């Protein structure tokens, strides 16, 4: 009803269509990517500096760190939106690694439509300090995108890319894409 064919457009990149959205996966350092939004996977205090979160806050810089702690003390947040700092993006959306991954990705997609953004880059949310299982994380990320497309909500969003720190986790995402393909 939605899934296209899995192929490799560039060395180390694997893609398929989900409705009108191009979904891609690759291994690498997410802080070297350019996109309208980059997603951080962090703690419920939005101040963690371990794994992906360490790289994102160090690269983004101290003003982004300060924006995070200011919003954390203002109210109870499921996620927060900051500037991009010295990352190559318009905004960072910081999600909680321990939360339901399908819910977190659905929120990211909705916030990107609100800003008329076209591109998103995310890590394998939850697979760091939160120690969620990679197979369940891949299923949840792709399920969120399918639901967004099924509801007719994809208008501005055209490209969603997962950049994954460990090659072994990339293999789990690729297998899930092959399970779903048309």
Ligand X SMILES: CCCn1nnnc1NC(=O)c1ccco1
Annotated binding site for a glycoprotein: 29-30, 41, 52, 126-130, 165
Residues lying near Cl ion in the complex (CB under 5 A): 41, 97, 123-124, 126, 128, 130, 164-165
Single residue of 12, 20, 29, 86 touching ligand X by CB under 6 A: 29
For residue 41, the SS3 value is: strand
Single residue of 39, 55, 95, 108 touching ligand X by CB under 6 A: 55
Distance, CA of 128 to CA of 163 (rounded, Å): 14
Single residue of 6, 23, 25, 31 touching ligand X by CB under 6 A: 31
Residues 150 and 114 sit within 8 Å (Cβ to Cβ): no
Quote the least distance from Cβ 44 to ligand X, whole Å.
20
Quote the least distance from Cβ 52 to ligand X, whole Å.
4
For residue 52, state whether it binds ligand X (rule: CB under 6 A).
yes
Cβ atoms within 10 Å of 73's Cβ, excluding its own: 9
Residues forming beta bridges with residue 161, ordered by sequence position: 24, 121
At a CB cut-off of 8 Å and minimum separation 6, what does 155 contact?
A: 113
């Amino acid at each position: 009803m939605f899934y296209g064919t899995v192929s490799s457009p560039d060395s180390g990149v694997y893609e398929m269509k989900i409705g009108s959205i191009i979904f891609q996966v690759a291994s690498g350092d997410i802080t070297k990517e350019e996109a309208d939004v980059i997603v951080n996977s962090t703690s419920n205090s939005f101040n963690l500096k371990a794994g992906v979160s360490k790289a994102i806050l160090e690269c983004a810089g101290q003003n982004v760190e300060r924006e995070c702690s200011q919003q954390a003390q203002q109210r109870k947040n499921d996620y927060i939106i900051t500037g991009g700092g010295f990352l190559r993006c318009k905004n960072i959306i910081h999600v909680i690694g321990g939360n339901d991954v399908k819910s977190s990705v659905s929120s990211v997609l909705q916030e990107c439509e609100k800003k008329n953004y076209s591109s998103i880059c995310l890590p394998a949310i939850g697979t760091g300090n939160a120690k969620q299982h990679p197979d369940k994380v891949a299923e949840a990320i792709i399920d969120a995108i399918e639901d967004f497309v099924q509801k007719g909500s994809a208008q501005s969003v055209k490209k969603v890319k997962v950049v994954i720190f460990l090659p072994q986790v990339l293999d789990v995402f690729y297998a899930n894409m092959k399970k779903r393909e048309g």
